[PDB]
């Protein structure tokens, strides 16, 4: 259908295949394939456990990847269990993905910043950090070793700071792998994204199984403030008939707009009111033939 829909489906598939485990990929692909799905639909399609889908749904809700709808309907058996519908909010999902990747790269940039300073000094007996600014006042008079205030122990140099190139390589290995995400959001930001909801996702649903316990039809509630073409073919003979009709409405219109007899004529002179060629043409055709031989569940209805 919409190429942008295929693009954002590729976004969701790639981010769940990259930053999430296989079962997350399974549930996200199930929601991407069948647009609206309930818990029994997932348990039927994937044969998944409730305790198995627990952390999956919790993580995908915390990352705003799957939207939950708390609508209950009225089945014929009236056992209206509170079924939850799992669908996707495409603008919310792409905003969450963009925010997460931006926060990851910003946190990595901050980690690179905090790794950019010199090493510092560690006390392993007390396991205490010491920066270069606060270790100035702990030296001895011998001018040999950094002595701790508590342990009075020879301090050792941190291995941090020398891992600056390692964090830079981590940034390089993150950035080229996330390049399809950036390239796809370049096309997304240059396009228009419609705000979908449960009702919008109902327009593009795929049936998960034959018999679904949860009804997909939306039930509104009061108090919730949360044409035809017809042609006429005439074989050049009935035109006189349509002109006969036209003059017949013409003459009845002139009759209904005519003056009455008592108006155009004076009524005072009358009393006061009170209480065969077929054989010929056959012989003709015979003569021409001889000549040519010679020279040669029920609801209410309307009709739409």
């Amino acid at each position: 259908d919409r190429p942008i829909d295929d693009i954002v489906k590729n976004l969701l598939k790639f981010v769940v295949r990259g930053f999430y485990g296989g079962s997350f990929v399974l549930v996200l692909d199930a929601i991407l394939f069948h647009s609206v799905l309930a818990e029994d639909d997932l348990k039927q399609l994937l044969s998944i456990n409730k305790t198995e889908l627990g952390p999956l749904i919790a993580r995908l809700r915390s990352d705003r990847l799957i939207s939950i709808h708390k609508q209950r309907e009225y089945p014929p058996n009236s056992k209206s269990v509170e079924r939850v519908y799992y669908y996707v909010k495409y603008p919310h999902a792409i905003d969450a993905i963009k925010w997460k990747v931006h926060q990851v790269v910003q946190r990595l940039k901050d980690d690179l910043d905090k790794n950019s300073e010199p090493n510092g000094y560690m006390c392993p007996i007390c396991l205490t950090k010491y920066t270069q600014l606060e270790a100035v006042q702990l030296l001895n008079f011998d001018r040999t070793e950094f002595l701790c205030s508590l342990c009075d122990e020879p301090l050792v140099e941190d291995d941090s700071g020398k891992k600056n190139k390692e964090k830079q390589d981590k940034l390089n290995r993150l950035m080229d792998q996330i390049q399809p995400i950036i390239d796809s959001l370049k096309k997304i930001d240059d396009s228009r994204i419609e705000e979908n909801t449960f009702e919008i996702a109902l327009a593009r649903l795929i049936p998960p199984q034959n018999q679904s316990h949860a009804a997909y039809t939306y039930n509104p509630k009061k108090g919730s403030t949360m044409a035809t073409l017809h042609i006429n073919i005439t074989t050049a003979s009935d035109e006189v008939a349509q002109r006969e009709l036209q003059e017949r409405q013409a003459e009845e219109k002139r009759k209904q707009n005519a003056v009455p007899e008592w108006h155009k004529q004076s009524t005072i002179g009358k009393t006061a009111l009170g209480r065969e060629e077929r054989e010929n043409e056959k012989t003709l055709n015979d003569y021409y033939a001889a000549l040519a031989k010679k020279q040669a569940l029920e609801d209410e209805f309307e009709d739409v």
Binding site: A30, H34, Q44, L45, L46, Q209
Partner: protein, 55 residues
């Protein structure tokens, strides 16, 4: 007459037939491609007929 066993009239050979008649990985990809739903393919009947499916 049973559909579980297929008989070849040109060769006189009886072979085992399964519900998921897959004997090659290409046939497995064709079976997954033919799925209209996202239902998983059970490996219980995949052992039936075609002897090995794990590797």
């Amino acid at each position: 007459k049973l559909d579980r066993i297929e008989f070849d009239p040109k060769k006189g050979t009886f072979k085992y037939l399964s519900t998921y008649d897959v004997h090659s990985p290409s046939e497995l990809l064709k079976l997954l491609r033919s799925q209209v739903t996202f239902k998983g393919i059970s490996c219980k009947d995949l052992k039936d007929g075609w002897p090995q499916c794990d590797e």
